[PDB]
Amino acid sequence: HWGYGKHNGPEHWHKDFPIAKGERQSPVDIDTHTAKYDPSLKPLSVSYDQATSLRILNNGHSFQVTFDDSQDKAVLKGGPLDGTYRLLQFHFHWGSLDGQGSEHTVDKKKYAAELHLVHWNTKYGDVGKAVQQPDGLAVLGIFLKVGSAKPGLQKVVDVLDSIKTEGKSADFTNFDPRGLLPESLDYWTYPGSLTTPPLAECVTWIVLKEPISVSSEQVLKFRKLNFNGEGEPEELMVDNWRPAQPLKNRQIKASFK
Numbered sequence: 644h645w646g647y648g649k650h651n652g653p654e655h656w657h658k659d660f661p662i663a664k665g666e667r668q669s670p671v672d673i674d675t676h677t678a679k680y681d682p683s684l685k686p687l688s689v690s691y692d693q694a695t696s697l698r699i700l701n702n703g704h705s706f707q708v709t710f711d712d713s714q715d716k717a718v719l720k721g722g723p724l725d726g727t728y729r730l731l732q733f734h735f736h737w738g739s740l741d742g743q744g745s746e747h748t749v750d751k752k753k754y755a756a757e758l759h760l761v762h763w764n765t766k767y768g769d770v771g772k773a774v775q776q777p778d779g780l781a782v783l784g785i786f787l788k789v790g791s792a793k794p795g796l797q798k799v800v801d802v803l804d805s806i807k808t809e810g811k812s813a814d815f816t817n818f819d820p821r822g823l824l825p826e827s828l829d830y831w832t833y834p835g836s837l838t839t840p841p842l843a844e845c846v847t848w849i850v851l852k853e854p855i856s857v858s859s860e861q862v863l864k865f866r867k868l869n870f871n872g873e874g875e876p877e878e879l880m881v882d883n884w885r886p887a888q889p890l891k892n893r894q895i896k897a898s899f900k
């Protein structure tokens with residue numbers, strides 16, 4: 644029932660998921676002048692060399708690439724994190740035009756899209772258990788701006804025609820998510836939540852300062868997807884982003900000066 648439209652969008656979500664109005668909701672605006680450099684923060688450790696992608700899926704809210712998370716193959720550690728977080732999937736949020744689409748904003752600036760690599764804490768054993776914990780998930784967030792093409796995104800873009808509508812999926816093996824990363828791993832971090840229902844307050848957010856550049860042709864292919872199932876009135880999958888939420892009693896910390 645939930646979505647991003649007038650009648651089921653972010654302003655409605657609190658009725659089914661009252662934590663929508665909680666103390667540690669995501670996304671937020673990153674005020675770069677207020678974020679405190681924290682020299683105790685470690686560099687982020689991103690170990691994706693043995694990542695095993697499985698499937699690409701249109702879930703009705705975004706598209707996602709799922710990975711084998713039954714061993715420590717593709718893991719996030721270090722940074723603000725204690726212990727080891729396994730990559731489960733990545734997905735994106737994007738706009739109807741280039742001036743909106745990201746969930747986090749930086750000094751109120753919206754990017755055209757935002758990539759989320761979702762990882763869960765292996766000390767909880769599975770992702771259902773992890774989402775019930777305040778340190779269950781770590782989501783690595785990467786901004787997209789429109790410019791030059793991102794070569795490492797092209798293999799994703801070229802199969803989107805095969806998953807146009809909600810429920811469709813396809814084989815998507817041997818995809819290397821290292822090809823989605825910017826040069827710098829400089830980041831901001833804060834405690835937050837899932838940005839979709841169930842909005843569980845279980846996420847350590849790690850948002851990279853450096854955006855990736857994607858081409859107008861790449862993002863245009865995101866915009867051809869459909870929220871609807873096949874045979875329903877065609878409603879383009881665009882503006883699938885939750886707006887910034889109140890920061891409340893939270894501090895955003897920077898890994899960099």
Ligand SMILES: [N]S(=O)(=O)[C][C][C]C1234B567B89%10B5%11%12B5%13%14B%15%16%17B8%18(B961B%18%152B5%163B%11%1374)C%10%12%14%17
Nearest residue numbers: 759761770774782836837838839841
């Ligand atoms: N936009 S976001 O905060 O990364 C939430 C992404 C959606 C999900 B929530 B649940 B938790 B894990 B799986 B399923 B839904 B799916 B993934 B994360 C599980």
Ligand SMILES: [Zn+2]
Nearest residue numbers: 734736759838
């Ligand atoms: Zn997301």
